[PDB]
Each structure stands twice: as structure tokens, then as C-alpha cells.
């Protein structure tokens, strides 16, 4: 779809067998969710944002469905105030900005 | 223009008579710059992001040029790790997401 920006660009996600909502976030390099339970090994990572840093778990090669489009890639799990779909996944679904 | 997401979507800005670069950030409600000097009255604001909160100065009705497009609106000034153009300005330049 085309999505305008009058409201937060929130879409429906399936990840790890669970359903969530997440913000299409062109300012995010990576994809971050709070309150998901992913399988297998992970690696602790510190990431920076406004406000400072956040410890996350880094999971690699995770399948995700983003508004009906399939992608796989790294998902970070940690205390973000809103789930975000970052460019690592957006590039796989052909998402672009236009003005 | 159309902008893909293989790299950070950074554009050239003029704000307060000064030239800067900033990220087109659909995950940002508001527009934030570090290291700009805006004229006139402002109001202290705490904003949240990953990592926690950040104190900013809130300036209203600030003209900005974003990749050659004119907008006016609220600009927040404070210690962000990267300057961001948020939806308050993106809607005025007709920016949309597409996939
Ligand atoms: C640069 C920064 C913009 C990136 N963030 C993405 C922005 O879109 C976030 C999304 C957001 C919204 C709300 C919220 F509670 C928390 C986050 N917006 C945000 O803080 O907005 C703030 C601010 C703007 O006005 C209002 O709107 C929401 C809120 C309020 C004040 S990030 O979440 O820090 C992030 C994401 C992925 C990522 N991947 C990395 N990988 C490492 C480098 C290789 S580092 C990294 C850092």
C-alpha cells in the first residue's frame, strides 16, 4: 500500500507465531520489539536512541510478515516504547519514501 | 524525489539560516535537531525514545526547507544522536511510504 503520515504508520505483523503491531520506521536501522518470545540463541547488544542506550537481545534470521509481505532478518527484543520495523526489513518488502 | 532505504534517508535542510543534514524519520512524531541556534521564545519539554527521555527546547512556527520543500512548524532542539525530520513536517511536504 501507500501510507500517508497524518497518523503514525502502524501495520500488523506476525513474528515468532505471534501477532503484533509495529511502526514503519525509516529512522530505524534495525527492527525492535518488546514482549515477543523468539526461539533459539541470541546475543546481548546495547543500542542507542534519544534518551541514551537500551540493552536488547539480538536474534538473527527471524521470519516476519509485515502487512502481508514476507521478510527474514535480525530482530532485536527489548524495552522499546513502541515496536518498530527498521530498514533491515523495509528494504526486503520494497518500501520507499516519496515526496 | 523517491528515496530507497538501502542507506539512511538523509537529506539537506535549511533551518534558522543554517544548513544541516537530517534523517527522514517516519517513526518520529516531531522534528529534532542538535546544535542549531533558533531565535525567540521556547518552552522546555521532556520527550521519550528508546533509551529513556531527553530534555529539549520546543520552538514553534519555525520555517524549514527540507530537500528544497518549504514547511513551518515545531522544531525541538536537544541532544539527539542524529537530526530527524518527523511527521509534523513530512506531512507538509507530501511525504508518503510505499510498498
Ligand atoms: C535515530 C532515531 C530516530 C532511531 N529511532 C527510531 C525513531 O524512529 C524512534 C522510534 C521510536 C518511537 C517511539 C519510541 F518510544 C521509541 C522509538 N522515534 C523516537 O524516538 O521518537 C521520539 C521522539 C520524536 O517525536 C515523538 O515521536 C516518538 C518519540 C517522541 C519524541 S530508535 O527507536 O532510537 C532506533 C531504532 C532502531 C535502531 N536500530 C539501530 N541499529 C544500530 C545502529 C546500527 S539503532 C536504532 C535506534
Residue numbers in the entry:
A (entry chain A), B (entry chain A): 1 to 99
Q: How does the study describe this entry?
A:
Blocking the activity of PR leaves virions in an immature state, which are unable to infect cells, thus leading to restoration of the immune system. In the present studies, we designed and synthesized seven novel PIs that incorporate the unique 6-5-5 ring-fused crown-like tetrahydropyranofuran (Crn-THF) as a P2-ligand as in GRL-142, GRL-121, GRL-001, and GRL-003.
In order to understand the molecular mechanism of drug resistance, we compared the structure of PRWT with mutant variants PRDRVRP30 and PRDRVRP51; each protein was crystalized in complex with an inhibitor, GRL-001 or GRL-003. In the PRDRVRP51 structures, however, we observed significant structural differences around the 30 s loop (residues 29–35). Actually, there are only three additional mutations present in the sequence of PRDRVRP51: L33F, I54M and A82I, strongly suggesting that the substitution L33F is a major trigger for these rearrangements around the 30 s loop. Concomitantly, the 30 s loop lost its contacts with the flap region, which appears to become even more flexible, leading to a widened ligand binding pocket. This could be one of the main reasons for the reduced binding affinity of DRV towards PRDRVRP51, resulting in the emergence of DRV-resistance. Additional factor that contributes to the enlargement of the flap region is the substitution of the Ile-54 (in PRWT) with Met-54 (in PRDRVRP51).
